[PDB]
Design a protein around this ligand. Structure first.
Ligand SMILES: Nc1ncnc2c1ncn2[C@@H]1O[C@H](CSCC[C@H](N)C(=O)O)[C@@H](O)[C@H]1O
Length: 258
């Protein structure tokens, strides 16, 4: 149902390749590799660390975490077709695992992960399932564990305009405020909860990607169609406009179990 919706619409094989073109190789979220590098700049891991990537996607996050730290990366994504694409990008590495599964029904041992890592994935979850997931993450984290999240946020729903309401509706996103997000983590007894409104930095990332799309339009049209260019071009235009006025926000979240 949730799996079928994502596979058959937003995350078809073609829809993801469109995303990857503008995001960067092996990514389906803003900034691609360069944003991932900055998000993990203050993260300390090594060859003995166990890492969970909720909504791993094409596996770009797991590839980087393993390359940089040498840590065991386990990536969970609900879309089977995407996992199949991710597995075909990694070979001869037993410390990178990709699994097609709903994170809400996936079982992990308590006190297992040093790092639980998620980028632009939890927005697909309802408010009730956000809370359920973060209770599960608290359990899954080692006592010395750390939770790292970047996700789409927004201003209060009362302030949304017609275009943004439609966008959230058709994407079936559940967008809460950065403040409501952090309170969920606090309610789940996460310690040292640090929330950052990185909508300005996100806006910068969007501008680069938008500029890239325009300067590679010919290469894009060879790969896809004008129709998908227009949807991608207008989509980024709206995100640039809305991120600037803080209507659609980019939340950063770091927390520990103790
Ligand atoms: N319930 C769920 N369980 C696991 N993954 C989910 C999920 N709901 C949505 N997702 C995943 O979240 C991903 C969002 S796109 C981002 C993927 C990657 N982390 C990156 O930043 O490059 C999608 O691939 C989607 O499959």
């Amino acid at each position: 149902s949730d799996k079928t919706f994502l596979e058959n619409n937003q995350y078809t094989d073609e829809g993801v390749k469109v995303y990857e073109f503008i995001f960067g190789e092996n990514y389906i979220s803003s900034g691609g590799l360069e944003a991932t590098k900055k998000i993990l700049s203050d993260i300390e891991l090594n060859e003995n660390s166990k890492v969970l990537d909720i909504g791993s996607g094409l596996g770009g996050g797991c590839m980087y975490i393993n390359e940089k730290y040498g840590a065991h990366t386990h990536g969970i994504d609900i879309c089977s077709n995407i996992v199949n694409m991710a597995n075909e990008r990694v070979s001869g590495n037993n410390k990178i695992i990709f699994e097609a599964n709903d994170i809400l029904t996936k079982e992990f041992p308590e006190n297992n992960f040093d790092l639980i890592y998620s980028r632009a994935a939890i927005l697909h979850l309802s408010l009730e399932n956000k809370n359920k997931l973060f209770q599960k993450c608290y359990k899954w984290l080692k006592p010395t564990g750390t939770l790292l999240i970047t996700d789409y946020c927004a201003t209060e729903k009362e302030n949304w305009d017609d275009e943004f309401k439609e966008y959230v509706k058709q994407r079936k996103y559940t967008l809460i405020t950065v403040e409501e997000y952090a309170d969920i983590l606090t309610a789940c007894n996460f310690k040292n909860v640090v929330s950052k409104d990185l909508s300005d930095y996100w806006n910068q990332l969007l501008e680069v990607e938008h500029k890239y799309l325009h300067e590679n339009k010919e290469e894009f049209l060879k790969l896809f169609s004008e129709k998908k260019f227009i949807s991608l071009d207008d989509g980024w235009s709206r995100k640039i406009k809305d991120s600037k006025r803080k209507m659609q926000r980019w939340g950063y979240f770091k927390a520990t179990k103790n």
